[PDB]
Design a protein around this ligand. Structure first.
Ligand SMILES: NC(=O)c1ccc[n+]([C@@H]2O[C@H](COP(=O)([O-])OP(=O)(O)OC[C@H]3O[C@@H](n4cnc5c(N)ncnc54)[C@H](OP(=O)(O)O)[C@@H]3O)[C@@H](O)[C@H]2O)c1
Lengths: 79, 159, 193, 48
């Protein structure tokens, strides 16, 4: 759909090189690697999330577009 | 013979419960006694605080009794309100200043100052007095086939 | 013969079909994207802060309960009523000789005199009228004690005995209460065949 | 059977204009109590 490409850049941790990238009918994969620092058994103190976003080419060979970039203190999960 | 002998001595045993016992006869306004169905909602509240709230410590004796008093004001508003509205009591933590959590409700429904308890708001009040997992109530609400349970349950901590 | 073009000019806006079909295709986008973005951010707010503290923001909202009344006449204070009657009236009537209705009641096609004055004056049932017409038609019963173990105190189904609140009674029964009250096609089992 | 019949009712409030004041508000308190009691009894019976 066209309304998901909105909710995507509606997000702050979803950024690309060119936000003008044609996002319809593409296939986006998220090879992400997250870090976290605790302050209780459940209440995190610092979460990081990062890892490139890749797109299926017409050859289905994935090529990067942008970078997930998330960080938050005092979380309770990972969004 | 229990319920009948409680019928004949009713006026008597409640005088004694008010005079010389730990858990008094609950339904007593300003010294003179009555039954639960003769006491008005406002009086029910103003008495619940007299027996479950400690003026000297200015703190509820239990969160369980404060939960009792809250779940009571819940129906108090559930009855007199006309349509569905938001609770004037959103977390019972408001009862920590009770004589004003009372006025807050009994100004939203001044009718509950004059009209007695609806009868479905008596057996509820009782099922809330014999609810497990809560400290038993520090008074006697009624005389029925469970009178001694009401009379001598958890009657040790009082000392 | 006359024609009378009461059209606002809609023959001038050209290619109106998709000009129309676009105006609404946009009103679903701008509607649905703020449906989807709104719910996930509210959902985002539930994983960084957790709903353990977000449940205290779900306010407790109370359903009114049925509190029937007796409709006693209201007594306005004495100054109000000594005014409405002639001032010379007091001390002028042998009150032993003034008859006065003191109660009344009724059993009609609409139940008691409280629940007919509703479909009489107000044309439809209140909450206190729909619970009473539910109780005198044997739809809802009472129950206190322990049903399903849990202490239930309040109205219940009478056929299935499954608890029912007085706020969901007007939805659950008002159809049949009105289906079977007042002038009706004669129901034979009320008249033994 | 040609049995007619016409009864007229007056508003109750015209009555209390015929009684002294202290007696009225005396009666007033009296009804106030009965109303509550009747409320109680009507609800016990209605329930059970
Ligand atoms: N041998 C001796 O000389 C001697 C002397 C004194 C006492 N005792 C024994 O020690 C016991 C002392 O207890 P008691 O007699 O004071 O209590 P009790 O009057 O027998 O009543 C206790 C009951 O009330 C409930 N309850 C009490 N406190 C509660 C709370 N804070 N929260 C939730 N539920 C609560 C419990 O329900 P649950 O079932 O949910 O727990 C329990 O079944 C007595 O039962 C007695 O037999 C023995």
């Amino acid at each position: 759909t066209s309304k998901d490409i909105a909710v995507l850049r509606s997000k702050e941790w979803f950024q690309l090189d060119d936000e003008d990238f044609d996002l319809l009918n593409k296939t986006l994969t998220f090879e992400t690697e997250t870090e976290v620092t605790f302050k209780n058994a459940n209440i995190f103190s610092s979460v990081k999330c990062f890892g490139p976003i890749k797109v299926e080419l017409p050859t289905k060979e994935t090529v990067e577009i942008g970078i997930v970039d998330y960080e938050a203190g005092a979380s309770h999960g990972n969004p | 013979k229990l319920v009948p002998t409680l019928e004949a001595k009713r006026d008597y045993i409640i005088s004694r419960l008010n005079a010389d016992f730990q858990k008094p006869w609950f339904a007593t306004v300003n010294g003179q006694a009555r039954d639960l169905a003769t006491m008005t909602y406002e009086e029910v509240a103003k008495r619940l605080v007299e027996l479950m709230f400690i003026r000297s410590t200015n703190s509820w004796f239990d969160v369980t009794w404060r939960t009792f008093t809250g779940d009571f004001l819940r129906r108090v508003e559930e009855r007199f309100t006309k349509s569905k509205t938001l609770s004037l009591i959103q977390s019972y933590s408001l009862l920590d200043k009770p004589d004003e959590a009372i006025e807050k409700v009994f100004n939203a429904y001044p009718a509950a100052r004059e009209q007695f308890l609806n009868a479905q708001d008596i057996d509820h009040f009782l099922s809330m007095c014999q609810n497990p997992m809560q400290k038993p109530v520090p008074f006697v609400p009624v005389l029925d086939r469970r009178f001694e349970i009401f009379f001598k349950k958890d009657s040790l901590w009082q000392s | 013969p006359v024609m009378a073009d009461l059209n606002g000019g809609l023959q001038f806006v050209p290619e109106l079909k998709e000009f129309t079909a676009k105006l609404r295709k946009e009103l679903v986008e701008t509607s649905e994207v703020r449906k989807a973005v709104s719910i996930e951010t509210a959902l985002e707010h539930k994983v960084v802060n957790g709903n353990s503290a977000d449940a205290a923001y779900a306010q407790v909202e109370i359903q009114p309960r049925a509190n029937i009344q007796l409709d006693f006449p209201e007594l306005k204070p004495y100054k109000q009523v000594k005014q409405i009657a002639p001032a010379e009236l007091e001390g002028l009537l042998d009150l032993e000789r003034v008859i006065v209705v003191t109660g009344f009641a009724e059993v009609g096609p609409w139940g008691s005199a409280r629940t007919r004055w509703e479909m009489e004056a107000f044309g439809e049932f209140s909450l206190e009228g729909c619970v009473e017409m539910a109780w005198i038609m044997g739809f809802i019963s009472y129950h206190n004690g322990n049903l399903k173990g849990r202490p239930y105190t309040g109205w219940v189904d009478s056929k299935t005995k499954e608890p029912v609140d007085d706020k969901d009674v007007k939805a659950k029964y008002e159809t049949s209460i009105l289906e079977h009250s007042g002038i009706r096609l004669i129901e034979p089992e009320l008249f033994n065949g | 059977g040609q049995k007619g019949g016409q009864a007229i009712v007056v508003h109750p409030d015209y009555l209390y204009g015929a009684i002294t004041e202290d007696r009225y508000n005396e009666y007033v308190a009296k009804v106030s109590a009965r109303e509550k009691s009747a409320y109680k009894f009507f609800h016990n019976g209605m329930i059970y």
